[PDB]
Write a protein that binds this ligand. Structure first.
Ligand SMILES: CCCCCCCCCCCCCCCCC[C@@H](O)O[C@H](CO[C@H](O)CCCCCCCCCCCCCCC)COP(=O)(O)OCC[N+](C)(C)C
Ligand SMILES: CCCCCCCCCCCCCCCCC[C@@H](O)O[C@H](CO[C@H](O)CCCCCCCCCCCCCCC)COP(=O)(O)OCC[N+](C)(C)C
Ligand SMILES: CCCCCCCC/C=C\CCCCCCCC(=O)OC[C@H](COP(=O)(O)OCCN)OC(=O)CCCCCCC/C=C\CCCCCCCC
Ligand SMILES: CCCCCCCC/C=C\CCCCCCCC(=O)O[C@H](COC(=O)CCCCCCC/C=C/CCCCCCCC)COP(=O)(O)OCCN
Ligand SMILES: CCCCCCCC/C=C\CCCCCCCC(=O)O[C@H](COC(=O)CCCCCCC/C=C/CCCCCCCC)COP(=O)(O)OCCN
Ligand code: SF4
Lengths: 59, 303, 156, 99, 98, 49, 70, 129, 83
């Protein structure tokens, strides 16, 4: 079985065209990326305090 | 006591640049699920000092064939312009009260490209010269739209005095009156300082870095004054100073945020962006902002 | 006397400044570079030590050789080393850079990066863990702390 | 006077700091060891110059708005902006903005 | 007639003489033309400001604009000349002779 | 990794690209012939690391 | 956590507080405790010059009140 | 009288014009022209032409000399004749300059046509073939 | 009618920047001729005194010229206060 990754056709009605124009002119997806990055800023980092803390190991 | 005022304007700017770098590294780290420098000093606070001391004690690599003259003048011009570009800013009282403050600022920004041109030419390398030419072309291209947006916005002010911008925004911010020009202005300020997504390019290198970062902080301060007007009470200017500094810090952190959030343009892509999306809209909005006060009988006072 | 005290204090200040900000240029020759990219990763965070990520050769302080050095690559590595401003330190990461390693008996591999450039710290491993390379970097910092240039100039 | 004192101070501080930065590492002893001419960039520079001239024409607008002849002033300002847009359009359609 | 006007006219004459010497580098000819333009701008501005000819304040800007356009044209021509020879040397333009 | 790239361009566009490789040629295939199969196994870890 | 970015930012704020505030204080110190008089348009300059002349101490900020009218 | 600061500036202007008039190393001639333009803009600013001096400093220096250097890179007594009255609550220079839109309709028309024709001419000349 | 609408729809997609710019420019050209406040702006500009009002020598034949600013005759600025 196989899937298609980029085989979609955008709608050409007036509402969808206006939505795309609003995306182009107001940079909505750019704001989405900014919000994702901002959300990442407010969560705890993964850094450990070497050499006082050591990475996990195995026998 | 004018020398004291000049020094008290000149030294804190350099200190703020030195710590801007620490903040820049730290903000990027915490946005990347890590930390910034937190070993050199209590919270990385000594990191700028260590960086400066290391850079000033590292050997300088003079090209041994370059024009020593222009190689020395270029950082001189960069730092001089970066520090001079701060003098007419009202906070809330400018160091120098200029009638045509905004023109002086525009002229200095126009001069800014000579340092890039001279640094590229004196490098004695074809590739560095090509890079300098690309940077100069991008800078002049975006400074055109910077100037047009600036005059369009100032049409609501009545003069080129920077202090009047405080009076104009006493009740409402200028961002509400014209947000599209503000968006284009922000992007053009990003493209002017060669900041991401437009970053296509020992002692003197540190000088150039300080000049660029002072330019970043200043541009954000100018944007805050121009579009986010703080209320000023003549009997305690400290409130206006605090508001202005907070807005400038917010805009600088937004710059670092954008740097951390996006890929970068190609050269032809940003050239096309400007010349085929910003310039037509800028001209249309310039016509709109010329005609609007006449339509609404809301022409500003000063003449 | 006070003459030795002042030079000792200034030497301490310069050593602290140099070791608290090491800007490395990395030769990502081979697999070891991957572990290098894991020490700049969030867990280990080289940047928090003052070690910046991917400095340019013209303003780099320490050279990290991470991977196998071939005969076709040695002149380029030597040219990059010559370009570096002083004071410059070289770190040998992994068996391939230390002594050739798994390709020691090969016709196209330099048997150790110290045939071409002098090396300050040798980090063993195939590959050394990101923690091991961090230990090597901190050892280089301690080595820098131990040095004394102003005192030598005074006594000479 | 005051502006000249400020400019002199700025230039002097920059020069002194650059010179000390360039001379501090020069006291300690160390080892001490083409043609192409792309045309598109020239067109970019010339286009910037022409548009800069038109902005120079547009600059007196903030004071142009108090004349009592608002109709004529508006007409001429809009005419200048329209011709600026026309210059941009002509450069656009003649493939002068391509890479 | 004050001395600053004499100094500006002397600068204009020096720039014209430099344009008329023609050592090489047609770019130098363009530079001399622009220097003459700058001298003209400065002295016209001084004359107009001194006598408070309020309307004549239009005249300098206009001049500047027009002359700058000329520079662009000249620059373009230079490029094409270089595009034939690779250098802007004056002696390369010896194909036409009187 | 490490790559040398010689390319000819007419202005911005790339007219010809030519990659020069072998800067990480260690001669694994010849070294494998001197090892047993178990001894030659770890080379494949290093092939695509 | 993220508040560990606050110290350095705070320092920047202090460095950005000094210039503006300083100017204000100096304008209060050299102009007799009042705002520095701005003079565009050449009429305010004439007002300042007249103030300086009638002051008697060659300082414009020294203000002569109604007590000086006899 | 500050040692004839206007005379000093004029002398520096003439010195710079002589310096770049010899045309040595056209990049150095351009730099000398930059210095001379700065001096002349300073003369105009000191005289009282704030807008016109800033117009010189912006247009001339930042656009035209910048394009000149770019193209080159692609290749290888006073204080007496002044007035005594006042100007009111505005600056006469600004009013006279802004009168370009209300008084100078003809000037605006001809200048705009010349600039558009200049754009067309530059495109036609640099088309090539 | 149909062709113009289809052209506008095809321009609103893949070229919204130019559509918005042309709309804004056309509106800026057209609206001032239709607004009723432009005459108000002209009158506001006319009422701003930049120069000293030079008095006229009285001859007994100017009933419309006041003798004092407080006198009823002369232009009034009540409409500007109401604005
Ligand atoms: C205004 C005039 C300026 C003139 C020029 C001076 C420039 C600014 C000077 C100020 C710099 C501050 C120096 C402070 C550095 C001390 C940092 C301290 O934390 O280091 C500790 C002490 O180490 C050293 O002993 C510090 C020596 C620094 C210098 C000592 C005093 C010298 C000051 C004299 C300066 C005067 C200059 C005169 C000529 C102009 C050990 O830390 P370290 O080992 O790293 O890290 C280990 C990591 N761990 C903790 C996680 C395990
Ligand atoms: C009659 C001949 C017509 C055909 C020949 C045309 C020749 C070339 C075309 C250019 C000539 C256009 C005529 C305009 C002359 C300007 C004077 C007249 O128009 O009066 C003006 C009226 O202004 C009008 O608004 C002029 C508007 C017309 C210009 C706009 C477009 C012009 C384009 C013409 C060709 C340019 C290039 C081609 C573009 C497609 C003055 O305004 P006014 O207020 O009374 O007086 C001001 C003085 N005050 C202050 C003391 C009171
Ligand atoms: C370089 C800096 C150029 C601009 C400096 C002055 C900018 C300015 O507009 O200030 C003018 C200032 C204040 O005037 P207003 O703001 O209009 O208000 C006063 C009325 N109440 O007045 C002055 O002109 C004083 C300064 C005059 C001295 C000459 C000015 C420039 C001299 C520069 C000479 C050195 C140039 C060397 C080469 C430069 C190459 C980049
Ligand atoms: C009733 C009377 C009203 C009069 C009319 C006025 C209404 C105005 C309506 C339209 C306004 C929108 C104009 C805003 C600017 C739009 C320009 C634009 O669209 O450019 C984009 C591109 O813009 C960008 O991509 C720039 C982004 C660069 C990265 C920066 C991130 C942006 C987000 C950060 C926050 C921005 C904050 C702005 C304000 C800051 C505060 C001062 C087009 O590019 P493409 O989609 O690729 O298409 C081109 C080929 N056809
Ligand atoms: C006289 C009034 C003018 C006032 C407004 C002017 C403001 C500034 C705008 C003009 C500046 C210059 C624009 C020049 C346009 C060039 C056109 C062009 O050739 O570009 C076409 C694209 O342009 C077109 O698609 C053709 C025109 C499309 C329509 C343009 C607007 C027409 C009228 C629409 C608005 C009408 C009123 C608004 C109605 C909507 C309801 C509000 C090719 O694009 P490429 O960049 O080469 O793409 C190649 C890579 N894919
Ligand atoms: S040293 Fe070991 S891990 Fe690193 S590249 Fe060589 S074989 Fe791979």
């Amino acid at each position: 079985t196989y899937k298609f990754v980029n085989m979609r056709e955008p709608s050409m009605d007036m509402k969808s065209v206006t939505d795309r124009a609003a995306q182009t002119l107001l940079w909505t997806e750019l704001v989405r990326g900014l919000g994702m990055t901002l959300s990442y800023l407010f969560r705890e980092p993964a850094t450990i305090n070497y050499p006082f803390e050591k990475g996990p190991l195995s026998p | 006591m004018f020398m004291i005022n000049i020094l008290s304007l000149i030294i804190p700017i350099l200190l703020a640049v030195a710590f801007l770098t620490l903040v820049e590294r730290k903000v990027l780290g915490y946005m990347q699920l890590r930390k910034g420098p937190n070993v050199v000093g209590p919270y990385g606070l000594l990191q700028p000092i260590a960086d400066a001391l290391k850079l000033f004690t590292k050997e300088p690599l003079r090209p041994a064939t370059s024009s020593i003259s222009m190689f020395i003048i270029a950082p001189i011009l960069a730092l001089s312009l970066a520090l001079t570009m701060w003098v007419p800013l009202p906070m809330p009282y400018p160091l120098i009260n200029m009638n045509l403050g905004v023109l002086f600022m525009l002229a200095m920004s126009s001069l800014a490209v000579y340092s890039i041109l001279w640094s590229g030419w004196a490098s004695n390398s074809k590739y560095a010269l090509i890079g300098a030419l690309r940077a100069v072309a991008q800078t002049i291209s975006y400074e055109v739209t910077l100037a047009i947006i600036l005059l369009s916005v100032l049409l609501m002010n009545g003069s080129y005095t920077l202090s009047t911008l405080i009076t104009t925004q006493e009740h409402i911010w200028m961002i509400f009156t014209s947000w599209p020009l503000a968006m284009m202005w922000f992007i053009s300020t990003l493209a002017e300082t060669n900041r991401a997504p437009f970053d296509l390019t020992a002692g003197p290198f540190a000088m150039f870095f300080m000049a660029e970062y002072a330019n970043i902080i200043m541009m954000n301060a100018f944007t805050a004054i121009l579009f986010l007007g703080a209320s000023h009470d003549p009997h305690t200017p400290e409130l206006y100073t605090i508001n202005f500094v907070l807005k400038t810090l917010a805009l600088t952190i937004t710059f670092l945020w954008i740097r951390a959030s996006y890929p970068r343009f190609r050269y032809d892509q940003l050239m096309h962006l400007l010349w085929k999306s910003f310039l037509p809209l800028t001209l249309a909005l310039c016509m709109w902002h010329i005609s609007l006060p006449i339509m609404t009988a809301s022409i500003p006072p000063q003449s | 006397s006070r003459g030795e005290y002042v030079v000792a204090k200034l030497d301490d200040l310069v050593n602290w400044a140099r070791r608290s900000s090491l800007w490395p240029m990395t030769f990502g020759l081979a697999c070891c570079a991957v572990e290098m990219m894991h020490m700049a990763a969030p867990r280990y965070d080289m940047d928090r030590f003052g070690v910046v990520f991917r400095a340019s050769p013209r303003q780099s302080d320490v050279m990290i050789v991470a991977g196998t050095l071939t005969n076709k690559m040695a002149p380029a590595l030597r040219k990059v080393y010559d370009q570096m401003p002083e004071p410059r330190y070289v770190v040998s990461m992994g068996s391939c850079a230390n002594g050739g390693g798994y390709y020691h008996y090969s016709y196209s591999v330099v048997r150790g990066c110290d045939r071409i450039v002098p090396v300050d710290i040798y980090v063993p491993g195939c590959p050394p863990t990101a923690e091991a390379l961090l230990y090597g970097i901190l050892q280089l910092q301690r080595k820098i702390k131990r040095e004394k240039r102003l005192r030598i100039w005074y006594r000479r | 006077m005051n502006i000249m004192l400020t400019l002199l101070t700025n230039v002097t501080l920059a020069s002194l700091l650059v010179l000390i930065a360039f001379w501090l590492p020069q006291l300690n002893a160390y080892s001490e060891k083409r043609l192409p001419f792309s045309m598109k960039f020239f067109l970019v520079a010339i286009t910037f110059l022409l548009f800069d001239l038109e902005i120079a024409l547009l600059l007196p607008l903030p004071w142009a708005s108090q004349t009592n002849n608002l109709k004529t002033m508006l007409t001429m300002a809009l005419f200048l902006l329209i011709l600026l847009a026309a210059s941009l359009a002509y450069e656009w359609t003649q493939k002068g903005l391509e890479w | 007639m004050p001395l600053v006007y004499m100094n500006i006219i002397m600068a204009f004459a020096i720039a014209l003489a430099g344009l008329l010497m023609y050592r090489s580098h047609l770019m130098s000819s363009l530079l001399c033309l622009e220097g003459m333009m700058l001298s003209l701008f400065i002295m016209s501005t001084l004359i107009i400001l001194n006598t408070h000819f309020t309307l004549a304040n239009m005249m300098p800007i206009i001049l500047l604009v027009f002359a700058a356009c000329e520079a662009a044209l000249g620059l373009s021509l230079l490029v094409m000349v270089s595009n034939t020879y690779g250098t802007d040397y004056v002696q390369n333009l010896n194909l036409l002779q009187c | 990794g490490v790559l040398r790239l010689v390319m000819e361009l007419s202005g911005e566009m790339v007219r010809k690209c030519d990659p020069h490789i072998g800067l990480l040629h260690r001669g694994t295939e010849k070294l494998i012939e001197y090892k047993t199969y178990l001894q030659a196994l770890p080379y494949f870890d290093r092939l695509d690391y | 956590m993220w508040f560990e970015i606050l110290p350095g930012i705070a320092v920047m704020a202090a460095c950005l507080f000094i210039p503006g505030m300083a100017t204000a204080h100096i304008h209060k110190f050299t102009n007799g405790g009042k705002e520095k008089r701005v003079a565009h348009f050449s009429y305010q300059w004439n007002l300042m010059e007249r103030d300086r002349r009638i002051s008697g101490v060659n300082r414009y900020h020294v203000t002569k009140g109604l007590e000086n009218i006899d | 009288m500050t040692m004839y600061i206007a005379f000093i500036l004029s002398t520096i202007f003439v010195i710079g014009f002589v310096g770049f008039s010899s045309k040595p190393s056209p990049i150095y001639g351009g730099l000398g022209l930059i210095v001379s333009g700065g001096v002349g803009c300073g003369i105009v600013l000191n005289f009282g032409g704030s807008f016109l001096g800033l117009m010189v400093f912006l247009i001339y220096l930042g656009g035209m000399l910048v394009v000149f250097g770019y193209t080159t890179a692609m290749a290888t007594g006073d204080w007496v004749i002044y007035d005594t009255g006042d100007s009111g609550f505005f600056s006469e220079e600004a009013m006279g300059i802004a009168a370009l839109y209300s008084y100078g309709t003809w000037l605006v028309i001809v200048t705009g046509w010349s600039l558009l024709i200049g754009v067309v001419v530059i495109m036609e000349i640099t088309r090539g073939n | 009618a149909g062709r113009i609408a289809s052209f506008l729809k095809n321009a609103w997609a893949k070229e919204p920047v130019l559509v918005a710019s042309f709309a804004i420019g056309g509106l800026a050209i057209i609206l001032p001729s239709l607004s009723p406040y432009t005459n108000y702006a002209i009158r506001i500009n006319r009422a701003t005194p930049y120069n000293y009002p030079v008095p006229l020598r009285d001859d007994g034949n100017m009933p419309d010229v006041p003798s004092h600013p407080q006198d009823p005759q002369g232009p009034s600025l009540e409409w500007l206060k109401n604005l």
